[PDB]
């Protein structure tokens, strides 16, 4: 019948996991006890994105709006435009597609429109330098997110173009049992509709914390200005720690609010970047669910990924339970033989997924 | 708490700042001869990893992850099995159980490159039943044979080409591309006859839930008033409103003279004015090339030989040839369509 889910938690993953697995799902009791029950505007918009990229799918939303029945179709993709409501930025709609784009009949060429940043959702430069490189390690050679216009909150007005030219049968089997060495730290500090000095004031703040490090720190000042600067003033930074040895990346990001000091945010994010590195073994937390899912959908092969005990949190635990309810694969965790640190190796067997939509 | 929030939880800024006045904690971070053998080494190397990891597992943990491996003797229990299977159970007839990948479960339109088998006597026909063998499954479908028309459209054919492949679309369970298959028209011993039975051979190229097969639909009219380039046409359209839709449409005569539909004539209904690159004659016939959508019939009749008592006389939908003979009906024919020899008188002009 239907593998039943409860609540709104992991809504995007549960639909995406259902679409990948092809198993129909039912999700009920979405905000039952709240004053405003049922799906939010950004959630229903997210659903509409799925049918633009899937063909033959049946999505049914209950009368009260608290229950949804999803019967996945075949990933077809193609060129399209999606207007993202102001309740959520483009990154809220971009990131689920990254799970599906390499598994399509036709290349994804999607133009998203709306707000391009928020405090809780993936930014443009998180996706560009933080998530795609994880895919590139998984065998998605060609992927890009072109920034045509930035739109700061609350008015937004930005637009980004998602293009995934690479179509592959399944992700290459993962084997990362080491702790990557960080060769350099880079990042993008950006601003819209304000004086350029703000970008430099962040770069002063981040440079202050990171100068104690023995590696280079080169942060780009991407001041946006003119017609392409969006409709509201805004600014934020994202710092990425790169490991050129095996193309591994950890990152942290944040945007600035009204009344906030540019130097302080530069201090905070650079402070958070170091925190994420402390919490990372091979991939950071905000990268992990992508890594976990891709290894699940690999060949009938055992994939090894080193993780830190600090990463294995409530977000991690709920992800794994969701994976098993759809895929039934169980992730086994083994300690490392080293005593200098407390890592653990995550071992996962792929379900033998294959891109059956692509014409040959 | 929930992954809808992409950004992970962090401690308060001041506490993070105090933690990170000193960054001493994190300072610690900062030949095969032939290419064939290299690929084999990669396969063998990874296969080595599976054995090592499984050996480290518990035997119960092994079964939980990998499952039951080949070589295991296993008891599988089923429910809701048809009662005919247990009753009409012949030990001579094998029972083959096949696990299904998620794709195999789905039903939809399957695209295949299909040819008549070289030893089969007759060419197959569109919308003509055919028992297919895809993957683990055997079933009967109504395929539609099509051509690409120089890779511009999906035009419906009437029969398989005599000695070459042709794209076929049929409704049934989906299967991965590169899934070969074969087709048979007759499986019963009664209708075996002597002729070779394997009817079609092909490879599945694409799976989809929709298709836009189209058929060439040609409108025909005749001229009744010719004025140099201009000429009036009749019998193409039944009312002026139809002509309004097709104004500006390209048309041509049999002779090859191209033209255009200019305007609809008020009297009589359906007549219209057309201008041709050169004067047309009365004997000529004007044609408008139009395209009409065609739909794949959703017919799924899985072969269930084992359930039957005979197990060798399963019969499903019959061919168009056999149905006509049973009902004593003649092969439909059109007198104008037939070909005759024509003798051309020598052309002379004043």
């Amino acid at each position: 019948k239907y593998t039943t889910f409860q609540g709104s938690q992991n809504f995007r993953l549960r639909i995406v996991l259902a679409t990948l697995s092809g198993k129909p799902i039912k999700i009920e009791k979405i905000r039952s006890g709240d004053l405003n029950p049922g799906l939010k505007d950004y959630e229903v918009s997210f659903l509409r994105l799925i049918e633009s990229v899937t063909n033959g799918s049946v999505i049914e939303i209950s009368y009260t709006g608290t229950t949804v029945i999803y019967r996945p179709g075949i990933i077809v993709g193609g060129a399209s435009t999606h207007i993202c409501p102001s309740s959520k930025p483009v990154g809220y709609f971009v990131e689920p597609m990254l799970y599906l784009a390499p598994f399509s009949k036709k290349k994804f060429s999607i133009l998203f429109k709306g707000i391009t940043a928020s405090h809780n959702d993936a930014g443009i430069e998180a996706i560009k330098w933080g998530l795609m490189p994880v895919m590139e390690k998984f065998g998605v050679r060609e992927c890009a997110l072109h920034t045509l216009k930035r739109g700061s909150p609350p008015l937004g007005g930005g637009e980004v173009h998602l293009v995934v030219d690479s179509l592959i049968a399944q992700p290459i089997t993962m084997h990362e049992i080491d702790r990557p060495i960080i060769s350099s730290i880079t990042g993008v500090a950006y601003s819209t509709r304000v004086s350029p000095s703000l970008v430099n004031r962040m770069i002063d703040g981040a440079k202050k914390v990171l100068k104690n490090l023995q590696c280079e720190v080169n942060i780009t000042a991407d001041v946006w200005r003119g017609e392409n600067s969006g409709k509201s003033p805004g600014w934020g930074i994202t710092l990425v720690a790169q490991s050129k040895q095996k193309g591994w990346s950890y990152f942290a990001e944040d945007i600035g609010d009204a009344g906030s000091i540019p130097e302080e945010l530069g201090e905070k994010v650079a402070c958070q970047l170091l925190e994420e590195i402390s919490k990372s073994a091979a991939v950071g937390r905000n990268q992990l669910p992508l890594a976990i899912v891709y290894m699940v959908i690999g060949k009938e092969d055992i994939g090894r990924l080193r993780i830190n005990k600090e990463q294995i949190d409530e977000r991690f635990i709920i992800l794994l339970r969701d994976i098993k309810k759809i895929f039934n694969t169980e992730v086994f965790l083994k300690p490392v033989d080293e005593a200098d640190n407390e890592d653990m190796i995550a071992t996962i067997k792929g379900i033998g997924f294959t891109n059956t939509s692509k014409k040959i | 708490v929930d992954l809808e929030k992409f950004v992970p939880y962090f401690d308060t800024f001041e506490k993070l700042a105090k933690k990170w006045k000193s960054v001493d904690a994190i300072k610690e971070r900062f030949e095969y001869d032939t290419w064939y053998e290299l690929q084999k080494a990669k396969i063998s190397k990874q296969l080595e990893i599976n054995n090592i990891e499984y050996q480290e597992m518990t035997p119960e943990q092994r079964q939980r992850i990998e499952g039951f491996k080949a070589g295991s003797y296993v008891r599988i229990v089923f429910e809701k099995v048809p009662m005919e299977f247990v009753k009409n159970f012949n030990p001579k007839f094998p029972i083959v159980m096949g696990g299904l990948l998620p794709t195999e479960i789905k039903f939809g339109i399957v695209k295949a490159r299909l040819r008549r088998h070289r030893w089969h006597k007759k060419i197959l026909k569109t919308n003509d039943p055919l028992v297919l063998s895809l993957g683990w499954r055997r079933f009967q479908t109504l395929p539609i044979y099509t051509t690409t028309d120089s890779r511009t459209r999906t035009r419906m054919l009437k029969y398989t080409p005599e000695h070459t492949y042709c794209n076929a679309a049929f409704y049934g369970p989906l299967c991965s591309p590169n899934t070969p298959f074969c087709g048979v028209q007759i499986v019963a011993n009664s209708d075996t006859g002597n002729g070779f039975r394997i009817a079609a051979t092909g490879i599945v190229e694409e799976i989809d839930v929709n298709i836009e097969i189209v058929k060439k639909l040609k409108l025909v009219g005749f001229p009744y008033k010719i004025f140099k380039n201009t000429a009036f046409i009749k019998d193409m359209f039944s009312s002026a409103m139809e002509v309004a839709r097709f104004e500006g449409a390209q048309i041509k005569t049999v002779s090859g003279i191209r033209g255009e539909i200019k305007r609809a004539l008020s009297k009589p209904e359906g007549h219209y004015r057309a201008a041709f690159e050169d004067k047309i004659l009365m004997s000529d016939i004007v044609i408008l090339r139009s395209w009409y959508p065609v739909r794949v019939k959703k017919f799924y009749n899985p072969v269930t030989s084992l359930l039957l008592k005979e197990k060798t006389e399963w019969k499903g939908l019959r061919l168009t040839g056999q149905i006509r003979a049973a009902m004593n009906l003649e092969t439909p024919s059109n007198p104008d369509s037939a070909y005759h020899k024509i003798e051309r008188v020598e052309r002379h002009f004043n």
Binding site: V44, E51, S57, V58, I59, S62, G65, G73 | -
Partner: peptide
């Protein structure tokens, strides 16, 4: 042109 090659669609009963 959007409707030409689609079999699914969003069914909103709200």
């Amino acid at each position: 042109k959007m409707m030409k090659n689609k079999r699914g669609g969003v069914i909103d009963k709200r």
